[PDB]
Amino acid sequence: IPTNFTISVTTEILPVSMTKTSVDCTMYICGDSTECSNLLLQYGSFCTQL
Amino acid sequence: IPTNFTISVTTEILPVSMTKTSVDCTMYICGDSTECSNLLLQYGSFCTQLNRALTGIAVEQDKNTQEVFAQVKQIYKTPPIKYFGGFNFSQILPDPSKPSKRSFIEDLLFNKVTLLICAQKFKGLTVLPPLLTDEMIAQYTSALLAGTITSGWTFGAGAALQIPFAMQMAYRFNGIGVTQNVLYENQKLIANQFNSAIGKIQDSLSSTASALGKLQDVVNHNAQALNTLVKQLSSKFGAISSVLNDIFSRLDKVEAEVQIDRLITGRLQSLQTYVTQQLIRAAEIRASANLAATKMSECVLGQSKRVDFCGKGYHLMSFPQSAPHGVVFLHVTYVPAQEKNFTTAPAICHDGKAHFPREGVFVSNGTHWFVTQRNFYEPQIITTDNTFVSGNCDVVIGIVNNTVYDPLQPELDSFKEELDKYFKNHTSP
Amino acid sequence: RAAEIRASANLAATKMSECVLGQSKRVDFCGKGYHLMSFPQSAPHGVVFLHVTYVPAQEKNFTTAPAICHDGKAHFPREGVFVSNGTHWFVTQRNFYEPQIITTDNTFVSGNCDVVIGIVNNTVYDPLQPELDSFKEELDKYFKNHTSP
Amino acid sequence: IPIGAGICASYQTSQSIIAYTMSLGAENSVAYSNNSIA
Ligand SMILES: *[C@@H]1O[C@H](CO)[C@@H](O[C@@H]2O[C@H](CO)[C@@H](O[C@@H]3O[C@H](CO)[C@@H](O)[C@H](O)[C@@H]3O)[C@H](O)[C@H]2NC(C)=O)[C@H](O)[C@H]1NC(C)=O
Ligand SMILES: *[C@@H]1O[C@H](CO)[C@@H](O[C@@H]2O[C@H](CO)[C@@H](O[C@@H]3O[C@H](CO)[C@@H](O)[C@H](O)[C@@H]3O)[C@H](O)[C@H]2NC(C)=O)[C@H](O)[C@H]1NC(C)=O
Ligand SMILES: *[C@@H]1O[C@H](CO)[C@@H](O[C@@H]2O[C@H](CO)[C@@H](O[C@@H]3O[C@H](CO)[C@@H](O)[C@H](O)[C@@H]3O)[C@H](O)[C@H]2NC(C)=O)[C@H](O)[C@H]1NC(C)=O
Ligand SMILES: *[C@@H]1O[C@H](CO)[C@@H](O[C@@H]2O[C@H](CO)[C@@H](O)[C@H](O)[C@H]2NC(C)=O)[C@H](O)[C@H]1NC(C)=O
Ligand SMILES: *[C@@H]1O[C@H](CO)[C@@H](O[C@@H]2O[C@H](CO)[C@@H](O)[C@H](O)[C@H]2NC(C)=O)[C@H](O)[C@H]1NC(C)=O
Ligand SMILES: *[C@@H]1O[C@H](CO)[C@@H](O[C@@H]2O[C@H](CO)[C@@H](O)[C@H](O)[C@H]2NC(C)=O)[C@H](O)[C@H]1NC(C)=O
Ligand SMILES: *[C@@H]1O[C@H](CO)[C@@H](O[C@@H]2O[C@H](CO)[C@@H](O)[C@H](O)[C@H]2NC(C)=O)[C@H](O)[C@H]1NC(C)=O
Ligand SMILES: *[C@@H]1O[C@H](CO)[C@@H](O[C@@H]2O[C@H](CO)[C@@H](O)[C@H](O)[C@H]2NC(C)=O)[C@H](O)[C@H]1NC(C)=O
Ligand SMILES: *[C@@H]1O[C@H](CO)[C@@H](O)[C@H](O)[C@H]1NC(C)=O
Ligand SMILES: *[C@@H]1O[C@H](CO)[C@@H](O)[C@H](O)[C@H]1NC(C)=O
């Protein structure tokens, strides 16, 4: 049988969220070029999904 | 200290499974074209991997519902009589008039959530049917409901044992922390707060259109993904045309292969992306289904002490209902009503010895002292049957000084005064 | 696959922490039926739990009442339930049959007996009174001997 | 063998392959009366 007690404090760390982000297709893929974008329009709708 | 209570019914919606689907190796990429299939044969064994992944997804989708809804191996049935001591359960038990054995709330849930495009999907895209038809799910739900109102929480542990409902609710209140008598003195009131509240559920589901958003999002996502997959194949991908037969009938056999190669690579990449997205969504739905199974096992089959788990407030009971690709829980819970202020003391010593409450708390209305419970107001005289002594009353801080009426004083002095009177009478002769 | 295995491992860690190192009140969590204890064992890339559990055996059906009014005052069981085999009543536990005579050591009073529904009639063998009768009877006998001559 | 839509197949009895509908479980009833307890 115990005859005495102690009171202790413990700490716990928990992540809750991560940094938001956003990307742009046209400038990343086709750098300040018009022909590249004109021919990128024919690749479908990947960018909408992203 | 509260002096009144209220009973509230809360709703909760959880998805349990997504729509099974399957895809074709060749009719999507090289539809009704021999040469395209012959050239595609040299790209390896990709769509075998796709088929294996989709078959695994479908099997897991069946297993989710099978695990969630099948926690009882004996199909109970409710007695024909429907007098549960004043409580009205006509809003959740199955309705025999309808050809489909469903209740009112299940009918509302089915009507609110709504599911040529399928005909348009000639491109080797099919939807498989689920293993468990809706009638069997409704029958499982009816079995749970009929087992949780005529046997308490016992049928989830062994042999089912019957018990009156008006006593089961007394057991539930005793579990919360308030003595059972407070039910038997207010039964006619409590039912009136139940039968009314359940009714207010039926309007609420049809009040706002965002109540069933969690169930609608699954079918919306599936339809949107399939539509994008169908519409993807209208893009040239840098080739000369999006029509496969035009390339072969306008060019010889020495450079057309380059353009059909570009087209086949594009379509393969799109299909792989779709498969990966389906895998992610399946994992999320599996996690949600596991949470729903835990909720069904703990909140329904028993009583939960985990605060804010099965509804806001102290938990009393729960009822399940089915819905398209999901489940709906109705949590019946107890909430303290208006309260009153009081003056309290930690301990009370009369004969140089401190007293402490056995269960409850001391309280005072201004002039006298009483001992009462914690979640209700019910004053009683301080008695040795209510208090236990320990040590002296010189070390506890904040103690007060008031007499304690030992019930041994009734139980013995009621005879002691009579004995003294008998002796006084006996003195004269 | 790694994400799925991590989820399963977290669940297994919770199982080891709650069912083994203590006793769990969560229904159908550490095994079917009421929980007693658990024992762990290892296995290639996994763990195996042996849950010991208690299950009620054959049962009998009796007639029950919510309360008892004896001196115009209702009585309620302190812990247990009232059951009768047909002739006269007893109070028992809820998970085992162990009849005992109704005593004030087992019941507490609350108000009058005209507000409760379904109440019955029976005498309460209030035990502190026979405890004091163990001296009351001898007191009466000794007073009879006192006044006899 | 889960076929689908509530239909399941198996191999049974002079032996062949049959297809039937699943049985959820054995039906059971509980005697409920407002002054009875088990
Ligand atoms: C705080 O609570 C106590 C306990 O109930 C209150 O004392 C009680 O007050 C009522 C109202 O006067 C008493 O009722 C009547 O008292 C007279 C006194 O002579 C009696 O002759 C009547 O037959 C009737 O009983 C009641 O007796 C009394 N309680 C006791 C034990 O005497 C007190 O008034 C409360 N403080 C407040 C409301 O500020
Ligand atoms: C319901 O339970 C009560 C309580 O046990 C039963 O009453 C008691 O039954 C016992 C067993 O039969 C009786 O003890 C026996 O009495 C006979 C009488 O001649 C005696 O010879 C035996 O040696 C033994 O002591 C007991 O007297 C009886 N209590 C009273 C107050 O009569 C009751 O029989 C049960 N009812 C049913 C339908 O089972
Ligand atoms: C438990 O015991 C109590 C009292 O020992 C019983 O209360 C008694 O109930 C009867 C009817 O059930 C009452 O009789 C009525 O008397 C009035 C006159 O007051 C008469 O006008 C009526 O026509 C009827 O005959 C009786 O008065 C009442 N006792 C008292 C003191 O008021 C109770 O019925 C018993 N419970 C069971 C289940 O047996
Ligand atoms: C229980 O343990 C505490 C902490 O060790 C004890 O408190 C100490 O008691 C000694 C002896 O009186 C003092 O000299 C110290 O200053 C105390 N510590 C503090 C932090 O105040 C306590 O006495 C123990 N109780 C018993 C019954 O042994
Ligand atoms: C405890 O609260 C209930 C619920 O409000 C009270 O019952 C109401 O009483 C008023 C009269 O004061 C009626 O107009 C309402 O119709 C009652 N509600 C229901 C659902 O019947 C009850 O009176 C309160 N108890 C106390 C002691 O104040
Ligand atoms: C249980 O609740 C149902 C639903 O309110 C009650 O049925 C209604 O009863 C009222 C009484 O006049 C009728 O006006 C409604 O048309 C009924 N609705 C339906 C859908 O039947 C039922 O009466 C209640 N149970 C008891 C015993 O009163
Ligand atoms: C009892 O508790 C209430 C709750 O705060 C005390 O406060 C009274 O009511 C409102 C709410 O705080 C305040 O704005 C009032 O100013 C308070 N009343 C007075 C007269 O100041 C209340 O004072 C407490 N009373 C007792 C006797 O303890
Ligand atoms: C409850 O009883 C104690 C003991 O009888 C009281 O303590 C007395 O306090 C006064 C001053 O407050 C002293 O002058 C006395 O000497 C104390 N008594 C003894 C025996 O030493 C206590 O005051 C009482 N409680 C209240 C609220 O008065
Ligand atoms: C409560 O606090 C007030 C002021 O802070 C103080 O005067 C009083 O003595 C305190 N009461 C107790 C029992 O400590
Ligand atoms: C049990 O229910 C029936 C019908 O509802 C009723 O006649 C009977 O009085 C009830 N039992 C008790 C003890 O009230």
mmCIF file with all atom_site columns, N, CA and C in Angstrom, chain B residues 242-266:
data_model
loop_
_atom_site.group_PDB
_atom_site.id
_atom_site.type_symbol
_atom_site.label_atom_id
_atom_site.label_alt_id
_atom_site.label_comp_id
_atom_site.label_asym_id
_atom_site.label_entity_id
_atom_site.label_seq_id
_atom_site.pdbx_PDB_ins_code
_atom_site.Cartn_x
_atom_site.Cartn_y
_atom_site.Cartn_z
_atom_site.occupancy
_atom_site.B_iso_or_equiv
_atom_site.pdbx_formal_charge
_atom_site.auth_seq_id
_atom_site.auth_comp_id
_atom_site.auth_asym_id
_atom_site.auth_atom_id
_atom_site.pdbx_PDB_model_num
ATOM 1  N N  . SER B 1 242 ? -7.552 14.049 -82.938 1.00 0.00 ? 242 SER B N  1
ATOM 2  C CA . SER B 1 242 ? -8.032 13.255 -81.817 1.00 0.00 ? 242 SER B CA 1
ATOM 3  C C  . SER B 1 242 ? -8.789 12.009 -82.255 1.00 0.00 ? 242 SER B C  1
ATOM 4  N N  . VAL B 1 243 ? -9.012 11.831 -83.555 1.00 0.00 ? 243 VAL B N  1
ATOM 5  C CA . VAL B 1 243 ? -9.704 10.664 -84.088 1.00 0.00 ? 243 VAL B CA 1
ATOM 6  C C  . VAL B 1 243 ? -8.659 9.672  -84.571 1.00 0.00 ? 243 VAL B C  1
ATOM 7  N N  . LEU B 1 244 ? -8.734 8.442  -84.065 1.00 0.00 ? 244 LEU B N  1
ATOM 8  C CA . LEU B 1 244 ? -7.686 7.463  -84.326 1.00 0.00 ? 244 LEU B CA 1
ATOM 9  C C  . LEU B 1 244 ? -7.769 6.878  -85.729 1.00 0.00 ? 244 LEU B C  1
ATOM 10 N N  . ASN B 1 245 ? -8.973 6.766  -86.291 1.00 0.00 ? 245 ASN B N  1
ATOM 11 C CA . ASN B 1 245 ? -9.111 6.163  -87.613 1.00 0.00 ? 245 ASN B CA 1
ATOM 12 C C  . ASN B 1 245 ? -8.662 7.112  -88.717 1.00 0.00 ? 245 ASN B C  1
ATOM 13 N N  . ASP B 1 246 ? -8.740 8.422  -88.479 1.00 0.00 ? 246 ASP B N  1
ATOM 14 C CA . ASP B 1 246 ? -8.317 9.384  -89.491 1.00 0.00 ? 246 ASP B CA 1
ATOM 15 C C  . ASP B 1 246 ? -6.816 9.313  -89.734 1.00 0.00 ? 246 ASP B C  1
ATOM 16 N N  . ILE B 1 247 ? -6.034 9.084  -88.677 1.00 0.00 ? 247 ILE B N  1
ATOM 17 C CA . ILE B 1 247 ? -4.582 9.037  -88.821 1.00 0.00 ? 247 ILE B CA 1
ATOM 18 C C  . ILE B 1 247 ? -4.167 7.866  -89.700 1.00 0.00 ? 247 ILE B C  1
ATOM 19 N N  . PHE B 1 248 ? -4.755 6.691  -89.470 1.00 0.00 ? 248 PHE B N  1
ATOM 20 C CA . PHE B 1 248 ? -4.354 5.508  -90.224 1.00 0.00 ? 248 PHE B CA 1
ATOM 21 C C  . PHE B 1 248 ? -4.796 5.594  -91.679 1.00 0.00 ? 248 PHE B C  1
ATOM 22 N N  . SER B 1 249 ? -5.974 6.161  -91.934 1.00 0.00 ? 249 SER B N  1
ATOM 23 C CA . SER B 1 249 ? -6.511 6.206  -93.288 1.00 0.00 ? 249 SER B CA 1
ATOM 24 C C  . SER B 1 249 ? -5.976 7.370  -94.110 1.00 0.00 ? 249 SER B C  1
ATOM 25 N N  . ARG B 1 250 ? -5.147 8.234  -93.526 1.00 0.00 ? 250 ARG B N  1
ATOM 26 C CA . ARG B 1 250 ? -4.577 9.364  -94.245 1.00 0.00 ? 250 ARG B CA 1
ATOM 27 C C  . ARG B 1 250 ? -3.060 9.319  -94.343 1.00 0.00 ? 250 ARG B C  1
ATOM 28 N N  . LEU B 1 251 ? -2.402 8.408  -93.632 1.00 0.00 ? 251 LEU B N  1
ATOM 29 C CA . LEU B 1 251 ? -0.951 8.324  -93.620 1.00 0.00 ? 251 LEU B CA 1
ATOM 30 C C  . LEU B 1 251 ? -0.522 6.871  -93.766 1.00 0.00 ? 251 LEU B C  1
ATOM 31 N N  . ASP B 1 252 ? 0.715  6.685  -94.219 1.00 0.00 ? 252 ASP B N  1
ATOM 32 C CA . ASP B 1 252 ? 1.269  5.353  -94.411 1.00 0.00 ? 252 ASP B CA 1
ATOM 33 C C  . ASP B 1 252 ? 1.742  4.801  -93.067 1.00 0.00 ? 252 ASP B C  1
ATOM 34 N N  . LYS B 1 253 ? 2.483  3.698  -93.102 1.00 0.00 ? 253 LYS B N  1
ATOM 35 C CA . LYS B 1 253 ? 2.827  2.962  -91.895 1.00 0.00 ? 253 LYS B CA 1
ATOM 36 C C  . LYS B 1 253 ? 4.168  3.368  -91.296 1.00 0.00 ? 253 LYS B C  1
ATOM 37 N N  . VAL B 1 254 ? 4.765  4.471  -91.740 1.00 0.00 ? 254 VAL B N  1
ATOM 38 C CA . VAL B 1 254 ? 6.121  4.805  -91.328 1.00 0.00 ? 254 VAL B CA 1
ATOM 39 C C  . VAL B 1 254 ? 6.213  6.016  -90.390 1.00 0.00 ? 254 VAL B C  1
ATOM 40 N N  . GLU B 1 255 ? 5.265  6.968  -90.427 1.00 0.00 ? 255 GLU B N  1
ATOM 41 C CA . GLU B 1 255 ? 5.282  8.035  -89.428 1.00 0.00 ? 255 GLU B CA 1
ATOM 42 C C  . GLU B 1 255 ? 4.013  8.148  -88.592 1.00 0.00 ? 255 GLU B C  1
ATOM 43 N N  . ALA B 1 256 ? 2.913  7.491  -88.975 1.00 0.00 ? 256 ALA B N  1
ATOM 44 C CA . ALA B 1 256 ? 1.689  7.589  -88.180 1.00 0.00 ? 256 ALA B CA 1
ATOM 45 C C  . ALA B 1 256 ? 1.875  6.995  -86.791 1.00 0.00 ? 256 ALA B C  1
ATOM 46 N N  . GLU B 1 257 ? 2.808  6.050  -86.657 1.00 0.00 ? 257 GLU B N  1
ATOM 47 C CA . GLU B 1 257 ? 3.059  5.425  -85.368 1.00 0.00 ? 257 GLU B CA 1
ATOM 48 C C  . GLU B 1 257 ? 3.540  6.436  -84.340 1.00 0.00 ? 257 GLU B C  1
ATOM 49 N N  . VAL B 1 258 ? 4.273  7.466  -84.768 1.00 0.00 ? 258 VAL B N  1
ATOM 50 C CA . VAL B 1 258 ? 4.750  8.483  -83.831 1.00 0.00 ? 258 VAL B CA 1
ATOM 51 C C  . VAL B 1 258 ? 3.574  9.213  -83.188 1.00 0.00 ? 258 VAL B C  1
ATOM 52 N N  . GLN B 1 259 ? 2.614  9.640  -84.008 1.00 0.00 ? 259 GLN B N  1
ATOM 53 C CA . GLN B 1 259 ? 1.485  10.397 -83.480 1.00 0.00 ? 259 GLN B CA 1
ATOM 54 C C  . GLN B 1 259 ? 0.570  9.512  -82.640 1.00 0.00 ? 259 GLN B C  1
ATOM 55 N N  . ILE B 1 260 ? 0.324  8.277  -83.085 1.00 0.00 ? 260 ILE B N  1
ATOM 56 C CA . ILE B 1 260 ? -0.493 7.404  -82.247 1.00 0.00 ? 260 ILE B CA 1
ATOM 57 C C  . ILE B 1 260 ? 0.239  7.073  -80.950 1.00 0.00 ? 260 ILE B C  1
ATOM 58 N N  . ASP B 1 261 ? 1.576  7.075  -80.969 1.00 0.00 ? 261 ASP B N  1
ATOM 59 C CA . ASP B 1 261 ? 2.345  6.885  -79.747 1.00 0.00 ? 261 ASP B CA 1
ATOM 60 C C  . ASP B 1 261 ? 2.143  8.044  -78.781 1.00 0.00 ? 261 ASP B C  1
ATOM 61 N N  . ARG B 1 262 ? 2.186  9.276  -79.292 1.00 0.00 ? 262 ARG B N  1
ATOM 62 C CA . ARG B 1 262 ? 1.904  10.430 -78.441 1.00 0.00 ? 262 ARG B CA 1
ATOM 63 C C  . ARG B 1 262 ? 0.523  10.306 -77.807 1.00 0.00 ? 262 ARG B C  1
ATOM 64 N N  . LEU B 1 263 ? -0.471 9.951  -78.624 1.00 0.00 ? 263 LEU B N  1
ATOM 65 C CA . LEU B 1 263 ? -1.842 9.865  -78.127 1.00 0.00 ? 263 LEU B CA 1
ATOM 66 C C  . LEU B 1 263 ? -1.977 8.785  -77.056 1.00 0.00 ? 263 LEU B C  1
ATOM 67 N N  . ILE B 1 264 ? -1.354 7.625  -77.282 1.00 0.00 ? 264 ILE B N  1
ATOM 68 C CA . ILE B 1 264 ? -1.476 6.524  -76.333 1.00 0.00 ? 264 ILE B CA 1
ATOM 69 C C  . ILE B 1 264 ? -0.771 6.860  -75.023 1.00 0.00 ? 264 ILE B C  1
ATOM 70 N N  . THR B 1 265 ? 0.373  7.552  -75.091 1.00 0.00 ? 265 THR B N  1
ATOM 71 C CA . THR B 1 265 ? 1.040  7.962  -73.858 1.00 0.00 ? 265 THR B CA 1
ATOM 72 C C  . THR B 1 265 ? 0.171  8.925  -73.058 1.00 0.00 ? 265 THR B C  1
ATOM 73 N N  . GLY B 1 266 ? -0.448 9.894  -73.736 1.00 0.00 ? 266 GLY B N  1
ATOM 74 C CA . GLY B 1 266 ? -1.317 10.822 -73.026 1.00 0.00 ? 266 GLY B CA 1
ATOM 75 C C  . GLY B 1 266 ? -2.471 10.122 -72.331 1.00 0.00 ? 266 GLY B C  1
#
